């Protein structure tokens, strides 16, 4: 009822999200891997887990890629959703422009969920390539920034212990200063001043502390297939009407906000996007910080359009 | 509460498994991990994400590997569950009788899982390591045997669908020829004869099917970590009192076969293997096959030793 | 997208039954209660319940019963699954003339409608159901079942209850319902079986188990908390492989076209999108399970009869 | 592991309570069934049910109730959650709850009481003065269900934003009919007007005589407290045994802060029971004036049921 597919599955994000999405897909569903190096391989070691009602379908690569790459036209034939993660910003532009033009043209009614890393650019890099063709809908593309949420939520639980909250809310951005934590949305005595300073900025630069660990090798691998995954299944149990979730995700402002493509809390539903809800009330301290994430975020979807 | 120690970490195959165990361990647990080169790496990539109950703390290894270092000593006390994945024969068998030695000097009284490749090789190694040191108990050394058992599920639900089983019993041994699925302890209608033949032969050289598809660059590591973080819960789960699960293991079996090291189902409880139960009731074909499979496994066992 | 009605939601048994589905029912279902008299306060007792995604509708019933009333037939409509739980040395000829009228009147607006039947008479009142659907001309036998879980719970508790690590999920029990015709298969299972002259005992409890409880109620009432537990883990499997979210495989009192020569056994069967799809064979069975089946198959050949004489 | 005794078994309210609580109690734990009349029916019923793992235990009453039943003492012992079901108004019901919690904290006074008789308000205040007489009294292993609120306000907020949902609502006061505040300005999204949050709120406050108007004077929600008095007991001992840390509203005893000695405020439970209390939190100013309003009522209820255990 489901067909999810997975474009460049052998890299290190790709195979553990593949991983973590046959053991939750529901019964009945159908995946799909693509790469240009190591789809076979990684497609016949799944094959063996068991996990009765879950088929595996498999499409190779080729030398050095040519565009439009036959191979991948008949594996988008009936896909619902499609995750674009692939990649190592002006070598992972052309990547993306080259898949989704791919991926669109057989079937143009699916959804798009974008885990690339300069989410910034290429989210909206990826509705310039849906214009060309003439098929786009604003609430078909998504992308992908639970990875915050989840370090935010985090890194509060610690501080707080022993007072547990679900989740926490942020907005702004996705890079590196755009992100902004909203402490004061959540219930419970907060902790203090001048400590939420220093909670905030770990959220901000979480990602350097990773590749210092690492001593300069690669990045935090585990962390976003973990995210890619949740996100992943919110979308499909959405589309099946076994959900209606409220999520957060870098979408694109239909009016709203003066910014064009900011990240702001969203209802998912059957046919994607179904309400787009206020911010909300917030101090002054997160009124200033905000004010400066948007003004980077312009900047941002202006550098990567001119590209396309 | 308790415990789980992993011991290299940081490789192909024990990365999906220590993100596999994180989601699943029981509120109040804590994870530990060890290698030698990428441990603080991998350790700071898990601390993010939210799951609220569970530690983590991490041991970095060293220079090119020594004889028995602190760092692994410090990480592997009152660890209840020691989880030994870690290697690349004579080279495997050197690496895994050494971590043994040094985690079994702190906390003799925990459970020791084997997940390395020679099964039927290296089990018998880490027992007659354990004897050395002065303290050895039958019902808490257990080696990881469910890799066959998840293939023989999925090769028969194929066959006969729309019917699914739960599990397939595998008794014999691991290598390549001495497993022995039993199909016939299954409920159903089992497809035809002169079938079975190339599924009980699919399963034997399964092996060999992933590493041809990769052109010889690798063997199956999402598979086998599927597998090795499955088997763990069911110790942990019945250490702590919350379960008395039946597993198939390439156990000890003090009498009963004679075997030293047989493959056979057994009950867990809280210290460990409590119950061994008989293998059952078999057929003619499979009889056969496990009379040559017993042949090779004693001299599999023989050569392990020896060393 | 999924309805799912209860006839007699206010009896003993059908408060729990609705309680116990209300919690385990998919996003989206929906739930209707239909009873003579008690539904509004069932109806409005159990909307107060969080339960997101899911709507609760009823329909009261009336004054001492009539036939073919004008609240089920409108309560009917788009119907996917029926779990008909209604009744109170004469019981059996109330329950039937109850089953009778209720499936006359559910089954005359939606036609491709699944069946269940909880009422206690089963191996009597399954085929009333099935003639009942033969006279009106719409009859499908791979949607009609009868509620038979509640003795595999039985044997399964006691045969755990005597070997003490060593538990088994589930257990073989063929034949009937009464209690001359269950016969559990303790053969078929993995383990080595305790001793002979132990499971004579084991299988006599298991098929005076009913009793034993009625007595130990001081003759007052009888089994409804128990009874309550196995028709919500089938209506469970049977929405669930309806909706194609699983193909199960269950032992349920349905019938067979050809196969055994009793025209109603209970053997397994699997579920799929369109009710039963694949019938299987009872498999091997030794000496002793042997004696107990041609004597529960005796039994069985006469309990048909009269329920279809009664129609 | 953990021993968990339900008294009252036999009625309405406690048949489905115990129903629930045999699906859901952890693997290795131990239910305890009490009543006066007719706990062999009840009990030789769910131990039919298979649920490996869990024993079923029993203990009959007597003729028309004594005083420190017998059967009761045995019963008591190793027990280490109690819930007080049993019930029938303010003089009769204060009579039976006085009797039972003589008689089960005299053997076990290191257990968790959980009060779920109707007069939460009156009857939870007169069980501290009888663990005073004996000499052990701990407020933080003495709570009140008052968690059937909880689940109407979600209900009814839910069905008017739809399809936004939120999972729980915080209320706080009391628990009778007036002395219920819903704070629906403490929960996500945008609040949807005025002047029928008004209707919101009240609807909660008046939603018992409801159910009672449709049964047409037959009885009340048995239904919904079971499901709410099986779901609070599950907090406590998930959290006596470690497995978690949850955050709950519930009618308790506060050591000083609010001046009202037994008000419903947020708590976090913990290994030894109670582990923090929490501060009520802002509120806008329409919800001040019905919040000032219940505590005067919460006032003449305590020493109401406060003074008859003298």
Redesign the interface.
């Known amino acids: 009822?489901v067909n999810v597919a997975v474009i460049g599955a052998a890299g290190g994000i790709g195979?553990?999200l593949?991983?973590l999405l046959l053991?939750e897909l529901?019964?009945?569903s159908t995946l799909s891997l693509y790469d240009v190096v190591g789809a076979?391989?990684?497609?016949?070691?799944?094959?063996?887990?068991?996990?009765?009602?879950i088929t595996v379908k498999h499409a190779a690569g080729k030398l050095p890629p040519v565009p439009r790459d036959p191979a991948l036209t008949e594996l988008a034939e009936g896909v619902d959703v499609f995750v674009i993660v692939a990649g190592v910003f002006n070598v992972n532009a052309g990547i993306v422009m080259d898949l989704v033009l791919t991926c669109a043209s057989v079937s143009p009614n699916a959804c798009f969920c974008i885990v690339t890393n300069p989410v910034n650019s290429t989210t909206p890099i990826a509705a310039q390539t849906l214009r060309k063709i003439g098929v786009y809908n604003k609430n078909k593309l998504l992308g992908v920034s639970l990875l915050d949420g989840?370090?935010a939520?985090?890194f509060i639980?610690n501080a707080r212990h022993?007072?547990?909250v679900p989740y926490v809310?942020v907005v702004g951005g996705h890079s590196d200063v755009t992100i902004v934590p909203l402490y004061s949305?959540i219930?419970?005595?907060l902790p203090d001043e001048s400590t939420l300073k220093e909670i905030r900025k770990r959220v901000q630069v979480?990602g350097t502390?990773?590749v210092k660990?690492?001593?300069g090798?690669?990045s935090?691998?585990?962390?976003m297939?973990?995210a890619g995954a949740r996100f992943t299944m919110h979308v499909v149990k959405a589309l099946m009407?076994?959900?209606?979730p409220?999520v957060y995700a870098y979408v694109d402002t239909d009016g709203e906000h003066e910014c064009p493509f900011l990240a702001m809390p969203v209802?998912l539903?059957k046919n994607g996007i179904?309400?787009r809800?206020?911010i909300?009330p917030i101090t002054t301290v997160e009124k200033e910080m905000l004010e400066e994430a948007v003004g980077v975020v312009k900047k941002n979807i202006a550098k990567g359009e001119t590209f396309a």
């Open positions: 009822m195979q553990s593949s991983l053991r529901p019964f009945g076979p391989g990684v497609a016949a070691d799944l094959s063996h887990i068991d996990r009765a009602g989840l370090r939520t985090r639980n022993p007072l547990v809310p949305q219930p419970g005595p979480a502390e990773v660990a690492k001593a090798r690669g935090a691998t585990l962390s297939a973990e009407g076994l959900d209606t409220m209802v539903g179904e309400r809800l206020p909300g």
